[PDB]
Amino acid sequence: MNVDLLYPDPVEEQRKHKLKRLVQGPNSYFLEIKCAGCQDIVVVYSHANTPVFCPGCTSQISIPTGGKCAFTSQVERYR
Amino acid sequence: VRINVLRDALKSICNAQRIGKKQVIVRPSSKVIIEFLQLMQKNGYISDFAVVDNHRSNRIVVNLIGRLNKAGVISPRFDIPANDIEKWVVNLLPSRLFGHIILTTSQGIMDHIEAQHRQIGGKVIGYFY
Amino acid sequence: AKRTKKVGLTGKYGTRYGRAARKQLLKIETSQKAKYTCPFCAKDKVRRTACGIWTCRSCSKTMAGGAYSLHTEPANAARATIRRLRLARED
Amino acid sequence: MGRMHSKGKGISRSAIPYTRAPAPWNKYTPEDVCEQICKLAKKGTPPSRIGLILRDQFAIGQVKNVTGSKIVRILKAKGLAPEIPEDLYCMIKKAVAIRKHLERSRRDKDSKFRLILVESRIHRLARYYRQARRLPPTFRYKSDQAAALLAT
Amino acid sequence: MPVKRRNNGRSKYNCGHTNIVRCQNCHRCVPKDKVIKRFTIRNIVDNTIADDVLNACVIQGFAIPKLYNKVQYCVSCSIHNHIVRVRSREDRKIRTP
Amino acid sequence: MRAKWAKKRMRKLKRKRRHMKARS
Amino acid sequence: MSKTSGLYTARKLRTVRRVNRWADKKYRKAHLGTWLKANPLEGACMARGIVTQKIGISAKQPNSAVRKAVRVQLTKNSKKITAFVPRDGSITYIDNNDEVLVAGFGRAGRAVGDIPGCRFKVIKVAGIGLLALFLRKREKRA
RNA sequence: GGCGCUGCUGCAGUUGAAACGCCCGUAGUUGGCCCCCCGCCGCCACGAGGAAACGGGAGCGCUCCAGGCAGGUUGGACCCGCCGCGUGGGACCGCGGCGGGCCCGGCGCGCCGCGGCAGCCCCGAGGAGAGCGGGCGGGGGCACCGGUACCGGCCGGGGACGGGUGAAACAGGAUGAUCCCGCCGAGACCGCCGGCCGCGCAGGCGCCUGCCAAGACCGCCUCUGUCAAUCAAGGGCGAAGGCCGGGGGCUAGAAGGCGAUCAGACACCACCGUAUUCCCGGCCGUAAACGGUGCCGCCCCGCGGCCGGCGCGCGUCCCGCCGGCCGCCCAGGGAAACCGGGAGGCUCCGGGCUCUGGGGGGAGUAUGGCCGCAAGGCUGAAACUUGAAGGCAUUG
Numbered sequence A: 001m002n003v004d005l006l007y008p009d010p011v012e013e014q015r016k017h018k019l020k021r022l023v024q025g026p027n028s029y030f031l032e033i034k035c036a037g038c039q040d041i042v043v044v045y046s047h048a049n050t051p052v053f054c055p056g057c058t059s060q061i062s063i064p065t066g067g068k069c070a071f072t073s074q075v076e077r078y079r
Numbered sequence B: 001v002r003i004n005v006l007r008d009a010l011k012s013i014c015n016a017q018r019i020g021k022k023q024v025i026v027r028p029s030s031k032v033i034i035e036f037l038q039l040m041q042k043n044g045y046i047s048d049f050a051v052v053d054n055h056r057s058n059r060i061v062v063n064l065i066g067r068l069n070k071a072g073v074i075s076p077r078f079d080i081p082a083n084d085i086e087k088w089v090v091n092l093l094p095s096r097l098f099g100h101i102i103l104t105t106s107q108g109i110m111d112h113i114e115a116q117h118r119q120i121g122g123k124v125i126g127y128f129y
Numbered sequence C: 001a002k003r004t005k006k007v008g009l010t011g012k013y014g015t016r017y018g019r020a021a022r023k024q025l026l027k028i029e030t031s032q033k034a035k036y037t038c039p040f041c042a043k044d045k046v047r048r049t050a051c052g053i054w055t056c057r058s059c060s061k062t063m064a065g066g067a068y069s070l071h072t073e074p075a076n077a078a079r080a081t082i083r084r085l086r087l088a089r090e091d
Numbered sequence D: 001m002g003r004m005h006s007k008g009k010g011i012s013r014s015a016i017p018y019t020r021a022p023a024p025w026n027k028y029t030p031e032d033v034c035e036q037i038c039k040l041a042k043k044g045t046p047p048s049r050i051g052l053i054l055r056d057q058f059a060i061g062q063v064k065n066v067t068g069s070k071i072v073r074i075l076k077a078k079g080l081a082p083e084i085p086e087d088l089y090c091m092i093k094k095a096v097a098i099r100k101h102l103e104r105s106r107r108d109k110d111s112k113f114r115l116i117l118v119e120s121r122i123h124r125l126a127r128y129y130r131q132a133r134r135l136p137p138t139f140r141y142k143s144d145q146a147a148a149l150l151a152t
Numbered sequence E: 001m002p003v004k005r006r007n008n009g010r011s012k013y014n015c016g017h018t019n020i021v022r023c024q025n026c027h028r029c030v031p032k033d034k035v036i037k038r039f040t041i042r043n044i045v046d047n048t049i050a051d052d053v054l055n056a057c058v059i060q061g062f063a064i065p066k067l068y069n070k071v072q073y074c075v076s077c078s079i080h081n082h083i084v085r086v087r088s089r090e091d092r093k094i095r096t097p
Numbered sequence F: 001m002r003a004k005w006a007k008k009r010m011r012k013l014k015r016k017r018r019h020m021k022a023r024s
Numbered sequence G: 001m002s003k004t005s006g007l008y009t010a011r012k013l014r015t016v017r018r019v020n021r022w023a024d025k026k027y028r029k030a031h032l033g034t035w036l037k038a039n040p041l042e043g044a045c046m047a048r049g050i051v052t053q054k055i056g057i058s059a060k061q062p063n064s065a066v067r068k069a070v071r072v073q074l075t076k077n078s079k080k081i082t083a084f085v086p087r088d089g090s091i092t093y094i095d096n097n098d099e100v101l102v103a104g105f106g107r108a109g110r111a112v113g114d115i116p117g118c119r120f121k122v123i124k125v126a127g128i129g130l131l132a133l134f135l136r137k138r139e140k141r142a
Numbered sequence H: 001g002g003c004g005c006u007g008c009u010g011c012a013g014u015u016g017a018a019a020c021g022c023c024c025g026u027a028g029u030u031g032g033c034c035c036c037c038c039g040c041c042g043c044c045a046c047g048a049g050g051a052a053a054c055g056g057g058a059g060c061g062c063u064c065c066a067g068g069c070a071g072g073u074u075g076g077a078c079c080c081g082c083c084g085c086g087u088g089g090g091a092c093c094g095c096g097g098c099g100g101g102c103c104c105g106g107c108g109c110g111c112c113g114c115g116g117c118a119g120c121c122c123c124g125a126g127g128a129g130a131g132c133g134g135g136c137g138g139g140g141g142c143a144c145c146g147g148u149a150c151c152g153g154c155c156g157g158g159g160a161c162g163g164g165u166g167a168a169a170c171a172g173g174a175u176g177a178u179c180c181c182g183c184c185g186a187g188a189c190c191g192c193c194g195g196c197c198g199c200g201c202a203g204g205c206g207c208c209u210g211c212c213a214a215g216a217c218c219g220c221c222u223c224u225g226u227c228a229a230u231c232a233a234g235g236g237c238g239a240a241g242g243c244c245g246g247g248g249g250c251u252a253g254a255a256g257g258c259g260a261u262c263a264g265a266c267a268c269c270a271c272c273g274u275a276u277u278c279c280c281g282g283c284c285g286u287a288a289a290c291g292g293u294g295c296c297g298c299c300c301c302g303c304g305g306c307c308g309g310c311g312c313g314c315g316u317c318c319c320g321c322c323g324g325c326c327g328c329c330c331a332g333g334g335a336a337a338c339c340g341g342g343a344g345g346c347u348c349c350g351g352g353c354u355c356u357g358g359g360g361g362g363a364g365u366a367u368g369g370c371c372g373c374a375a376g377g378c379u380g381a382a383a384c385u386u387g388a389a390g391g392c393a394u395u396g
């Protein structure tokens, strides 16, 4: 079908490598988390590889995984 | 490391046309390539192009219409007196009737016909026909 | 300016005794004239006083060592093995 | 990248947002982010890690977007810059580590190979900084002098 | 002498050196990725006597032990004993076992 | 000859010439 | 480009040419001077001498014949050469002490045809051209 | 001149002659993108100034002509020296606190904030280095350590030949061999698994346990700000064999010895055996050190396989992305064989850098020099001789 290369499709452009899009963009983002023991929701990096805590908690709520990071038993969102 | 972003642009375009593509993307851009595509355009060998921005060295998207036998660059940019243009014409162009050698001069980027209309000289960049 | 090209400290011997012997002595005599690090003193002041006897000129310990160097390779290996065998005798 | 001293030819790197502005959730002000930067600078965290800490714990992806300057220029502005630049310091540190490993291992030619490569990079970077006036005209790297310079 | 095979007569991909194996027939030194290799599994008595052994055994449920031996030859011995055959120029490109 | 063995021959000849010149 | 380029490489483009010219056998042959030395004529079209002996030369492998020649002692530098006497029957006109004039066969001192070892020929004997002497236009005295 | 067989224009380097065994690296050469309208080079144009003759070139019937400047108010016009000097341009290619008043014609030199200037940072490369996280691997060094086998020795059992070959003969055995079983000693080696698997700069890399520093890749809204590419001279590494000094010594085994074969056999085959093969400290610097294919960068119809990391999906699979190793192959290339991740984008020839070749011989020789303990290595001619040598391919 007649595709113009100057106004491409976002879904097919995202499948690509991040440097080889038309206009280079990032892959990471930020997301909210809800604590088991407290009410507030904190904002965390999608690829966190440094310790992340729970404001009261001296335990860690995040685990490095080489890519996107895991979190020790909290309940998430996206925004 | 990359040296001649214009050399790479022109090779990409001639490959794409040889296949029979409608568009082609060349990166990076620069002032000289914008000048060269503009001369190509007003001579009437290509359609639209658009320079798309990324707060960096940009990209260019070029539209092709199947007219361009060849395009290339002359490295290094040798210096030319006003009376050697024809000894370069009968060397690079297929005929004395069509084709273009491209000069950079203190009165603009222009083709050979103008460079003689003003009987001045310069340093040669490329050719196309 | 450098004074000899090859003979080094064996220039004291002149033209006598042949090439192989002088080649061996350059190595031996450099080793036995060298300063060594005192395993107690912490400093590089150990000099030879007799064939197997080495004294630190700063802290004044005396030690028993090799003929022409303070440590020998057999003694290094033996000390390592004896230490390991002791440690294996500690349960 | 990974191409100057081997056959690497990799491309893994970071790609930053086109838009340059703070986040809808940003409530910090250049004042207070500089506050955090300088408490961390005293505590002893290097500039390459300070960015990680404020990306993760404080949730700011870029520092210039919120403030207008770069972390090392903030350190210089408030007067907390190291004498030696950071990546030259890391290269000297690795050179010291390999030299010290070779002090016990005399027959490790592969390590000696790596030592030459690291020190060639050290000399080239020293030349750049020195002609660029980020370091004294008398600055020099000497392997024999290097090991105690790190404490200062 | 142009080149006869794309693989140069061996299977060596992305390395400089491979191990040595002795030929079983003649005991020549051959690199491992060039040697001709086969695996055989065979009983230790011929099947023309496996029935007599199996009738004359005493153990109720006894089974004949097998053998697992990997044969490795050089090119000369392989061709001479007919493990591999010289082939037509077309046929040389066939890898079917 | 096989070039390997021509080479071995030439080396022996050069050795002989050098021994010859060494006298005087 | 497998050749150097760039506006500031004239010195290298000249160094390469100067070094590689000597790898041509003709340029070396005409510009090194060892041939100008080894040349019996010392770089001329012709030279004279006295005949010292008459000889016959057995032709090369395919053909079979006995060509005719003379051993000549050059006057200008006291060298020995051999010269092929051409043109059937002429070998009689070359006595045992004659002033003969010697020129080349062509090919700048290379053997021609099937005559081994000879790069020169005689064109005049005792002041008379051997062409005309063969063609009965002039005659040697007695 | 022919000759694009000297190649700037414009040659060749898989197999015809020809890519240094590899990595680092100074001089040299080259170096992304960006602000216009200032200065200093380069460059382009147009001038000024200095020799004719020659070379072009306007006019002229020595009867023509090679000529000469003639001639019937005349005429012999004009061009052509140059990396220097002058005027103008300025695309391309490099390199680079301010006002105001004291103050006064300027210009310096200072003097006071004396508020007039928005006072004084491109960006962050599908360049590079540095970092953090994650896995990955016969990548490297030191210690320690298991296993059968080969060889040697000892106890016992039993009693005739054993070994070796295509067939034999020399070695062995009633001083009981060959064979069976148990025990001891030493030094190599690391099977099956083991691969269109994997790692390293190449040479290369495979027992157990411990220790030690590294490495490329991926992921990343982390740091810096061109710090880069290739490289004479110079430095490091470098299979096997070989050399010097110590140690060790099972296997195999140059040399040496011996049984056959043969016309001969000083060879192939059988048997015994020294250096060597192993370790430590050096040296030497070469291999069909091979993909017979230099390094960096771009574009490139497609279909598969395996290896490492990542992400989306449904309910291990499945689709993609980056990096590596491989097969097949449209086009295009080529003398072809074949290549095709290039050997493509090249007589329609110009991205950057370094090395090498110029018919066959003589010759890698003679000679000089540097290096080496030596064995050598590196550099390397001339006279003279020759009509071919050689590549890939077709039929017999």
Ligand SMILES: [K+]
Pocket: A014, A015, A016
């Ligand atoms: K994606």
Ligand SMILES: [K+]
Pocket: A016, A017, A020
């Ligand atoms: K992609």
Ligand SMILES: [K+]
Pocket: A016, A017, A018, H321
């Ligand atoms: K991706």
Ligand SMILES: [K+]
Pocket: A018, A027
């Ligand atoms: K990515």
Ligand SMILES: [K+]
Pocket: A027, A028, H311
């Ligand atoms: K991601």
Ligand SMILES: [K+]
Pocket: A047, A048, A049, A066, A067, A068, H219, H220
């Ligand atoms: K990550």
Ligand SMILES: [K+]
Pocket: D003, D004, D005, D006, D007
């Ligand atoms: K590199």
Ligand SMILES: [K+]
Pocket: D009, D010, D011
């Ligand atoms: K890449």
Ligand SMILES: [K+]
Pocket: D119, D120, D121, D123, D124
């Ligand atoms: K360096």
Ligand SMILES: [K+]
Pocket: D082, D083, D084, D149, D150, D151, D152
């Ligand atoms: K410091």
Ligand SMILES: [K+]
Pocket: E001, E002
């Ligand atoms: K051939």
Ligand SMILES: [K+]
Pocket: E008, E009, E010, E034
């Ligand atoms: K092979």
Ligand SMILES: [K+]
Pocket: E013, E014, H196, H325
């Ligand atoms: K493989």
Ligand SMILES: [K+]
Pocket: E012, E013, E014, E015
């Ligand atoms: K492999």
Ligand SMILES: [K+]
Pocket: E015, E017, E018
């Ligand atoms: K392998």
Ligand SMILES: [K+]
Pocket: E035, E036, E037, E038
């Ligand atoms: K096989």
